[PDB]
Amino acid sequence: PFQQFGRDIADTTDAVRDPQTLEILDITPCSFGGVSVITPGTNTSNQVAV
């Protein structure tokens, strides 16, 4: 009951609480990064891959 905000070991927001009703919650960042292109040599064809 003494909790209004949250954080975690690495000082990152671990949980936030709806301040109008009390239910467990977590925050996991959406994409976790990552945009790269696995394409073969452009001397070869243009069939791309992501």
Ligand X SMILES: *[C@@H]1O[C@H](CO)[C@@H](O[C@@H]2O[C@H](CO)[C@@H](O[C@@H]3O[C@H](CO[C@H]4O[C@H](CO)[C@@H](O)[C@H](O)[C@@H]4O)[C@@H](O)[C@H](O[C@H]4O[C@H](CO)[C@@H](O)[C@H](O)[C@@H]4O)[C@@H]3O)[C@H](O)[C@H]2NC(C)=O)[C@H](O)[C@H]1NC(C)=O
Ligand Y SMILES: *[C@@H]1O[C@H](CO[C@@H]2O[C@@H](C)[C@@H](O)[C@@H](O)[C@@H]2O)[C@@H](O)[C@H](O)[C@H]1NC(C)=O
Residues 20 to 49 in contact with ligand Y, rule: CB under 6 A: 41, 43-44
Q: Which is nearer to ligand X, 20 or 36 (CB)?
A: 20
Give the one residue of 3, 10, 19, 20 binding ligand X; rule: CB under 6 A: 20
Partner from ligand X, ligand NAG, a second copy, none contacting 3, C-beta within 5 to 8 A by type: a second copy
CA distances from 2 to 6, 15, 22 (A): 11, 14, 12
Cβ neighbours of residue 5 closer than 8 Å, sequence gap 6 or more: 16, 17
Going by C-alpha positions, the residue among 40, 41, 37 that lies closest to residue 50 is 37
Binding site for ligand NAG (CB under 6 A): 28, 41, 43-44
